[PDB]
């Protein structure tokens, strides 16, 4: 409810961190959602097995690097377009702090030796327990480290009024 | 989900709502993450295009029916296993309130007439704008209404010490 942002995916750079939305709780705590954009929109997508395995690993490793000093992660979830994840948290860490934690978590993916070190990979604890690939998760993580992580600007990427009009007044 | 309840997927009923996590905030507010389980674990899955199209519709429709009266949705995002969505929100609505909102939102999906009506479905606003199917999204929605929405219990579904040892 403070700011959410309509940004232009045709100009979006990746890998990148961007503040997607800021909200406040009734007693005034800040909640921030970050766009952790792994793939360039409409050019690249993550594979379904590797995104799922990465999901099992990512929020744990992000918590290890990012929690504390005014930040408590709520959830990290995949985007339905398979180009990134949204991470919701209590606090207002800056984008570079988030990027650095993200890269450290990617590096942590690469030291996963085998599937027995993937948390919850079994029929009791995973909804689709065959839909997994450590090697694809590690390919994703390696890609992020090879490409580095940029900080994207909501001002730069903002869709102007006119364009949002053109798009929204085709939705009816 | 980070810091989740360790529940037994092999016994989880679906469609169902479940409290997946609760958190406090520094000045004392509450956050709740709900497991919106569409598919029976390891028996059914949603198709990738339909889940994506549903993601585009669901947030909006859910806010229509659920926001207000001590609740503000943060995010509704798909699960990587494609069996459900996690909904994070500020507040502590009961499970049945959430189930009622969810069904109303599914009914809303069914009145979408064409793909052009779907918010943000275009190259400017979607990361994978070809990966969409309104018909799959409506099939999903219809299945929820046909099956109804149960409330699942973390106490009922808790994995026992002996099983967690086995794991
Ligand atoms: C939405 C989703 O769960 O389905 C396809 C993608 O794999 C996903 O985002 O992880
Ligand atoms: C191991 S369950 C993890 C939930 C996941 N981080 C999501 O929010 O979709
Ligand atoms: Zn899983
Ligand atoms: Zn999309």
How are helices and strands ordered from N to C of chain A?
EEEHEEHHEHH
The number of strands of chain A is 6
Structural class of chain A: alpha+beta
CATH architecture of chain A: 2-Layer Sandwich
Name the biggest interface. Answer: A-B, 59 and 56 residues
Number of helices of chain A: 5
Structure characterization notes:
The structure is a homodimer. With 172 residues, the first copy, chain A, is an alpha+beta fold. Chain A has a single domain (1-172), classed as Gyrase A, domain 2, CATH 3.30.1360. Helix content of chain A is 35%, strand content 20%. Chain A has five helices and six strands, in the order βββαββααβαα. Chain A has helices at residues 48-66, 95-110, 134-147, 154-157, 161-168, and strands spanning 3-4, 16-24, 30-37, 72-78, 84-90, 150-151. In chain A, strands 1, 2, 3, 4, 5 and 6 form a six-stranded mixed β-sheet that branches. In chain A, a hairpin with a 5-residue loop joins β2 and β3. The longest helix of chain A has 19 residues, at 48-66. The radius of gyration of chain A is 17 Å and the shape is globular. Chains A and B meet through β3, α1, β4 and β5 of A and α1, β3 and β4 of B. Bound molecules: (2R,4S)-2-methyl-2,3,3,4-tetrahydroxytetrahydrofuran, methionine (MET) and zinc ion (2 copies). Chain B: Keywords: Autoinducer synthesis, Iron, Lyase, Metal-binding, Quorum sensing. Chain B: GO terms for molecular function: iron ion binding; S-ribosylhomocysteine lyase activity.
